[PDB]
């Protein structure tokens, strides 16, 4: 297997979109890890870095990058991040491992979002990967009940805490054939901070490393 | 303290709805302070107490009530709270005391929501009192910009952190003629934790103390 080589390929290809002086936004996760290492070749163009997690921030600072709060940066020119799932319309499930809320905020504040994935993330319909939802701890049980009513199977990630001080519910069993509609419905549930459907603002570009080490750009 | 007398009047009237043994939900603020005080008369009827703020929890425990986390309380039977504004359809603006998120969660989980106000909170169109919006800190400026596109004037509430570790934007200039629509569209903004429009789940009962010390029930 060469999943790491595919991740590195997609990350290396994406970094080439850094062609001018920008405020760069950086995702979280294993694929982004390869992207972060590649950024040492673009120091002349990276004016400002905004980070979606403390894990990414730690890695970026170790490489000599000046990571600033989004409030100080204003807007991101280019945000680069991975995904758990990507469908045929560049709509994503994100937030599996960490950073759901700040990743979604970074995407919102970014003029361009490039998603980097290996082929295993590519699906026709979202939902096989469980949907992460970050929730206010006090509302966890109420929200789980409302998700049951929506047809999902909610599970509490017991003892997990986000860097926003919140908890996570994973939703299993969902066939998400209408991402726009379900992302909207979940946003309406009191106590939901963020849900992991990235559809209302999808990826602008998807760089996919294929099983044969080719690059396909959606 | 004429207004204080009106608030005590409204709170005393609401407390009389505690007729059977219930799971009680407690709001936040000066009006609720008079209700909490009155709760000593209803001890034998209050099995469980859920609190909407740390401030209310300290007060409730100072009077020897057992404050119970909503997750093991399950469903609130009766929630009593105040508001910043109440229109003609029992749709509210809340969050002047910065506790809107947990208050909104309590309302969602409550079988009956009783809102207690003096007549100065009664309006025909919501929005003259600034709409509070709880916001993930890193998303503050981004959200401020989006609020401007909705015709609002966002002002960061200085030196204020919520029980949930978040910041508040107070939004001026909105004429909220369709609170259901605006509440829905603010829920769609990435980084918004809770907005202070209580309309999709309005109050079930409003108890209003008028300027001539009478009680009007809406
Ligand atoms: O405490 C002040 C306001 O009633 C918050 O809703
Ligand atoms: Na939200």
Which string of DSSP letters, residue by residue, matches A156-199? E-TT---TTS-EEEEEES--BS-HHHHHHHHHTSTTEEEESEE-
* Residue B112 near residue B206 (C-beta atoms within 8 A): no
**What is the end-to-end Cα distance of chain B in Å, rounded?**
24
Compute the distance from residue B83 Cα to the ligand 1 centre, in Å: 5
Q: CA–CA separation, A215 vs B172, rounded Å?
A: 49
For residue A140, the chain B residues in CB contact (below 8 A) are 71
Q: How far apart are CA A58 and CA A35, in angstroms?
A: 14
Q: Residue B189 has what DSSP assignment?
A: S
Which DSSP state fits B130?
A: P
Q: What is the C-alpha separation between A100 and A103, in angstroms, rounded?
A: 5
Report whether B54 contacts B91 (CB < 8 A): no
Nearest residue to B142 via CA among B193, B195, B189, B196: B189
Residue among A71, A140, A141 whose CB faces B138 most closely: A71
Residue B104 in tokens: 């909104």
The architecture CATH gives domain B1-124+197-218: 3-Layer(aba) Sandwich (3.40)
C-alpha of A110 from chain center: 13
Residue nearest to atom 4 of ligand 1 (CA): B83
For residue B95, the 8-state DSSP code is -
Looking only at the bridges linking them, the beta strands covering A131-135 and A167-172 are antiparallel
User: Nearest ligand, CA of residue B97?
Assistant: 1
Query: Would you list which residues of chain A are within 8 Å, Cβ to Cβ, of chain B?
Result: 69-71, 74-75, 101-102, 104-105, 107-109, 136-142, 164-165, 184, 187-188, 190-191, 193-194, 200-201
- Residues B132/B94, Cβ–Cβ less than 8 Å: yes
Cβ atoms within 10 Å, residue B44 = 8
Relative to beta strand A192-195, strand A131-135 is antiparallel
User: Quick one: tokens of A213?
Assistant: 């080490």
- In sign, the C-alpha dihedral spanning A102, A119, A5, A111 is negative
Pairing state of beta strands B131-135 and B192-195? antiparallel
Place of tokens 């969050």: B95
Mode of pairing for the β-strands spanning B22-26 and B46-51: parallel
Pick the catalytic residue: B38, B85, B103, B183? B103
Token pair of A165, please? 């001080």
Interface test with A, best of B68, B191, B201 (most A CBs within 10 A): B191
Q: Is A48 left (phi over 0), alpha (psi -120 to 50) or beta?
A: beta
- The closest alpha carbon to A51, from B138, B55, B112, belongs to B138
Specify burial of residue A165 (Cβ count, 10 A radius: 0-12, 13-18, 19+). Answer: exposed
φ, ψ for residue A84 (rounded to 5)? -85, -40
Sheet containing strand A215-217, edge to edge, reads A46-51, A22-26, A76-81, A110-118, A205-209, A215-217
d(C-alpha B44, C-alpha B20), whole Å? 9
The one-character DSSP state at B39 is G
Superfamily of domain B125-196: ACT domain (3.30.70.260)
Residue B5 to residues B30, B31, B92, B122, Cα–Cα distance (Å): 11, 10, 22, 17
Q: Among A105, A144, A49, which residue's Cα sits nearest to residue A95?
A: A105
Residues 6+ away with beta carbon under 8 Å from A26: A32, A35, A36, A49, A50, A51, A52, A56, A60, A79, A80, A81
Contacts of residue A77, Cβ cutoff 8 Å, sequence gap at least 6:
A22, A23, A24, A110, A111, A112
Classify B167 in phi/psi space as left (phi over 0), alpha (psi -120 to 50) or beta: beta
For the Cβ of B95 lying below 6 angstroms from any atom of ligand 1, the answer is yes
* Alpha-carbon span A17 to B130, nearest angstrom: 43
What the block records as the tokens of B15 is: 């407390």
Q: Which residues pair with B126 in a beta bridge?
A: B176
Instruction: Among the bound ligands, name the one nearest to the CA of residue A190.
Output: 2
Among candidates B6, B180, B28, which has minimal Cα distance to B89? B180
Exp. method: X-ray
Give CA–CA dist A82/A103, Å, rounded.
10
Q: Which helix (H) or strand (E) holds B146?
A: helix B140-149
Here the tokens at position A162 are: 């986000």
Which DSSP symbol is given to A218? Answer: -
Contact list, B135 vs chain A (CB under 8 Å): none
The first and second tokens of residue B90, run together, are: 């029992």
Contact in structure between A187 and A195 (CB atoms under 8 Å): yes
Cα separation of the two ends of chain A: 24
The one-character DSSP state at A130 is P
Helical spans, DSSP H, in chain A: 3-15, 30-38, 54-62, 70-73, 100-108, 140-149, 179-187
Yes or no, beta carbons of B71 and A191 under 8 Å apart: no
Ligand 1 contact via B23 beta carbon (within 6 Å) = no
Instruction: Report the distance separating Cα B22 and Cα A23, nearest Å.
Output: 55
- From the list A155, A160, A85, the residue with the least C-alpha distance to A118 is A85
Q: Which atom of ligand 1 is nearest to the CA of B29?
A: 1
A102 contacts B141? CB cut-off 8 A: no
Tokens of B55: 């401030």
Burial A26-57 (b: 16+ CB within 10 A, else e): bbbbebbbbbbebbeeeeeebebbbbbbebbb
Nearest C-alpha of chain A: how many angstroms from B6? 31
Strand order across the beta sheet in which A92-93 lies: A85-86, A92-93, A197-198
DSSP state of A72: H
The residue assigned the tokens 């001026």 is: B172
> What whole-number distance in Å separates Cα of residue B180 and Cα of residue B159?
30
Alpha-carbon distances, residue A62 vs A35, A65, B43, B103, B120 (angstroms): 14, 7, 58, 42, 56
- Resolution of the model in angstroms: 2.3
Question: Residue A125 and residue A208: Cα distance in Å, rounded?
Answer: 17
Between B105, B142, B190, which is nearest A139 by CB?
B105
Output the CA A88–ligand 1 centroid distance in Å.
46
DSSP state of A216: E
Nearest-angstrom CA–CA distance, B180 and B201: 9
Cα(A143)–Cα(B105) distance, integer angstroms: 10
Phi, psi of B215 (to 5 degrees): -110, 125
State both tokens at B92: 């509210």
Asked about A103 being catalytic, the answer comes back as: yes
Give B186→chain A minimum CA distance, Å. 9
User: Where does residue A64 rank: exposed (0-12), middle (13-18), buried (19+ CB within 10 A)?
Assistant: exposed
Structural domain spans, chain A: 1-124+197-218, 125-196
């Amino acid at each position: 297997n060469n999943q790491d080589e595919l991740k590195k390929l997609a990350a290396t290809e994406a970094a080439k979109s850094i062609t001018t002086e920008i405020t760069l936004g950086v995702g979280t996760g294993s694929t982004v890890g390869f992207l972060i290492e590649e950024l040492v070749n673009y120091r002349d163009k990276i004016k400002t870095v905004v980070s979606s997690s403390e894990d990414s921030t730690r890695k970026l600072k170790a490489l000599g990058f000046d990571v600033v709060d989004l409030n100080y940066a204003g807007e991101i020119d280019l945000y680069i991040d991975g995904a758990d799932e990507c469908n045929n319309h560049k709509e994503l499930i994100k937030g599996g491992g960490a950073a759901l809320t700040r990743e979604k905020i970074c995407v919102a504040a970014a003029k361009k979002f490039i998603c980097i994935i290996d082929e295993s993330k590519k699906v026709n319909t979202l939902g096989n990967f469980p949907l992460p939802i970050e929730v206010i701890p006090m509302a966890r049980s109420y929200i789980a009940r409302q998700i049951v009513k929506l047809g999902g199977q909610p599970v509490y990630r017991e003892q997990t805490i986000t860097d926003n001080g919140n908890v996570i519910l994973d939703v299993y069993n969902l066939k998400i054939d209408n991402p726009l509609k379900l992302e909207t419905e979940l946003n309406q549930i009191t106590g939901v901070v963020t849900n992991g459907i990235f559809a209302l603002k999808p990826a602008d570009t998807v760089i996919m490393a294929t099983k044969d080490s080719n690059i396909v750009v959606l």
